[PDB]
Amino acid sequence: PVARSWVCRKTYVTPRRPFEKSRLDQELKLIGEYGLRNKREVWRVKFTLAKIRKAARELLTLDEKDPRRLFEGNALLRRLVRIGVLDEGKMKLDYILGLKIEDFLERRLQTQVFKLGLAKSIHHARVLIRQRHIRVRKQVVNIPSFIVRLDSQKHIDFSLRSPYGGGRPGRVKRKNAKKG
């Protein structure tokens, strides 16, 4: 008897076969293109996509006017549209089976900081977010994997206390300007 919860889940699955060249090359491609730390982040996003595809196939086995199929398919499609992975006009459970890992990778905060020109590269974007230079609508975010919603796409701003933002300079600039 403790007032503690023990509920937790693993957020990835390891691949079944360890050393396959095509899978290794595809994972390395996605790591390099999206500036990721290791293979586990690719496996995490792959796990999320596999769970969503399993939910879509399960709802596709149901008949069209099943209330659970309509309710849960509508909720799943609404979530996928809300994080920008699917288009608003493609709200249909068949198109979920055509989704790719690259859309979920593009909706990360690292990729959006790169694509909105706040960073000169994807690795610059990662080190920018990690060092409290980025805010999303009011809130400083450190997490590169922060998945951005379409309502927060236009509010990625740039940290009103950051030296490149609000203006108060960093440690190096005060130390170097103090010499002379």
Place this chain on the structure above:
Amino acid sequence: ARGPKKHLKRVAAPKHWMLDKLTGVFAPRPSTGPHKLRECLPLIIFLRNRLKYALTGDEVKKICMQRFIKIDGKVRTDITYPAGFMDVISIDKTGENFRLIYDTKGRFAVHRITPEEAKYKLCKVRKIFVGTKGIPHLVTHDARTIRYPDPLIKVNDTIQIDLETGKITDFIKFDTGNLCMVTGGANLGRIGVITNRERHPGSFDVVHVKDANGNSFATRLSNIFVIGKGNKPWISLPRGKGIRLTIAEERDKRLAAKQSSG
């Protein structure tokens, strides 16, 4: 065990109390009283979790034993006193009155009532017997014994009783076509008119009830509380009128409410 239990674990508490997992290992454990353990809302959960005058159980004790809370017109200072269906809670200091009646989801709604409606309550008659020197008694659902009832009042009927005195003031028969509210089972909280009662001797009767929207649902005879005569309830009802919406129309109503405001 070697004797009766005094503790209720929090995960083993009744789910409609809406307690969380991480506040403690214990739940408030209702006292013995006019209601069952699984079918009551203790006073500490009402004053702290629902109505939010208090932040801790110690503040609940400080509220209750200043003699502010009346249940059915009687001052109670037991913080775990089991209050249940149709019970009137009166706070004279803030001028508030409540009846503990169910939501459409089976949870005790915070239902505010008028101070003239707090003068009375309804009770379901659970037994009729004749005691010594030929004196008829009825026993209600909240452990009330009334001597000399009307000879027309039977078991499953509903008495309208005056909390100032405790005597029978009016009554409603169990009949097909009267309004009822479901107080147990899977249809807890729904309201409708009785359309058919089928009888199973040596077993449980099954009452069929039809909603005001035309939906039909059955329950046992134990789960039926007759509220109003024919079609008009004799007490105030919550915001939902016993109409259980499905998850689709509840989502639609939530989206329309979000669209209208915001």
Place this chain on the structure above:
Amino acid sequence: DQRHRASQLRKQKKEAVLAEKRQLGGKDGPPHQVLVVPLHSRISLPEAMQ
């Protein structure tokens, strides 16, 4: 039979360990000799011995 056999083996081993632990430092054996070694210079050995 298994329970009683395990009981016998446990009783044997515990008796032997009791004899072994009682011989040292008790009234039928030699004193328990403790060598105190400080491993650093800031350590006050006299305070430890007091």
Place this chain on the structure above:
RNA sequence: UACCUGGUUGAUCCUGCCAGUAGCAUAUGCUUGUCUCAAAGAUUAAGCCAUGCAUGUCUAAGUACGCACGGCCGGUACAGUGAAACUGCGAAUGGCUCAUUAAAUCAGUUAUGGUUCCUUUGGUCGCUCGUACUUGGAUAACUGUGGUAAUUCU
């Protein structure tokens, strides 16, 4: 994601098992910057235990002549606070462990029209035709004398 790689023969195919592979558990090895949760003497010994703590409790409302304190007003029995002690209640809940135990336990379902139930809540409590404007004896705490190496002994 209903996936595989290799091992017998001069070489080909096969039965067949094995090794690699992935998850879960325990242990252990090496290594280890930050932050959030978080299991943790079960397995072998329901083996054995030094020491300390784990269950006590008073309101206006059972009993106050402990000056242990404390204002009266003075015949005003008892202001008030209150150690001790008697009385009442609780200590049958909680916590631990998994030895036992194989239609037993337990689960779902039914029954008490075959029983008990402190407590809470409601009813009943001039329904009996027969010293009371208040009854009797003690016993603690307290005082005083003690016994035993030793006890929450007396």
Place this chain on the structure above:
RNA sequence: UGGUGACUCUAGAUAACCUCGGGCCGAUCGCACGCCGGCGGCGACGACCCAUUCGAACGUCUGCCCUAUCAACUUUCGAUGGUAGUCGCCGUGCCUACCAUGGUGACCACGGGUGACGGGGAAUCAGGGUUCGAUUCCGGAGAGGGAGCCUGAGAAACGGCUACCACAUCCAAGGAAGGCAGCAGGCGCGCAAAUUACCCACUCCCGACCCGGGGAGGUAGUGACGAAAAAUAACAAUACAGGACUCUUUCGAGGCCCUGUAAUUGGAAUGAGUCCACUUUAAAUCCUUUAACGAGGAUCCAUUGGAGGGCAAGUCUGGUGCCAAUUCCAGCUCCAAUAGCGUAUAUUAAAGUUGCUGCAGUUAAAAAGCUCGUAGUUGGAUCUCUCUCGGCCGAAGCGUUUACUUUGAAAAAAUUAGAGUGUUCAAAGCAGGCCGCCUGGAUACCGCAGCUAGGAAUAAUGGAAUAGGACCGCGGUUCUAUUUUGUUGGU
């Protein structure tokens, strides 16, 4: 009178009884005091009984692993049933007396074993399954082993008592005390597991109680069990190496771009740390928030394993021995994952190597000399709703009974699936959102068995063939009407 589906129910009447180890019918305590010596309002505490609540305790139906190298067991000593009682809170072979000889079993009894507490549940997952569930929720059991009590509403109680058994503490030798499978801690055992810490602030519990107490519980300590998030560098100029595009047939030119590699330069940005102050909190720590210091080999230095036989990855180097091949040792290079990665053991999946789904048996594991031959398993075709009483309906017999299928009710939470919600993200949590108000705390699943109401294909089953078979009326015999012989005797 009143009730049930059914009473030997509830209530009523009569005759009495009513236990001295005795059944109720108040010699109790506080606060405000007021009316005509008498009348009184709030309470507190007790209280026989009735109901309720919290239970408990005995029963019903269905459901459990291995074993035949356990095939008959129970029955004098209760085994199965009857009658009367005893005891018990009550039903009962619970026990006693007398009877009957019964009860269970190849549909696996009885016996034994389990590295067996049972479930909710966990791992895997196409599906069926397979393995795990000592362990925080629910139920049970036990407090060294047995046994027996007291008190109490409740215990066969062990942080109660009394013995014996096994251990064991003190002693002046007479005596006295004992029970960590509570919290810490120790020894032992082992491959195997944390501090003799702080606090009742939270959750709740107990008590005469707003006030006291709680190793329940909370909070720190240890903790790479495991799960989540996530640093160990980024950019610009320059120099080389490529790839585009303009101009040239090309070589080539691009102050034309793009992308890489740096014993090359350059200041910008930051955490890790050190350390005021807040915040946090019972008091603190941590986290968050903030001053100050804090980065070039940013030495503020990432590890663990494997490769020269197959999945990822070697035409390498040097020592040391045997007759260039060849034992042992140390390196280099490459590959994998990464704050983590190897190893052992068990198990699961690959696995269709336990096969119901779904395997095999000529020649590879394996089909019996042949025929007859219990049980079990399996079995051709065929057969298209009504009668009475009460307001077109309700009650009633069902129609052979099933098996099968569907519906309805009823069915702890947690976990699982899943809806909502910017925990800074996430694993989580049950929250929150808007300028007092507005909302949430859904929903699904929940085998089997048992209740409920339908369906009639499939598969059993039965209904007349020695006719003592239906449907009608005529009947004869026996028992039998509760009332239509005002009150009655009635053959």
Place this chain on the structure above:
RNA sequence: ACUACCGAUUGGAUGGUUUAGUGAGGCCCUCGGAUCGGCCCCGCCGGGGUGCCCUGGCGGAGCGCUGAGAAG
């Protein structure tokens, strides 16, 4: 020299079914009666209705009547 089996000694100890016998301790019953109190009797005696009675405190004996009750 090592590993692994048999083994006379009813070898010694321990346990589980049992035959026969003994049996602590509690509980119940039938006795028992250490002690403790009341009534009756009497003595020291206060008042009244005017020596009949009783009122209250102390003591004395009576296996008289009894009630509670420990060990065994």
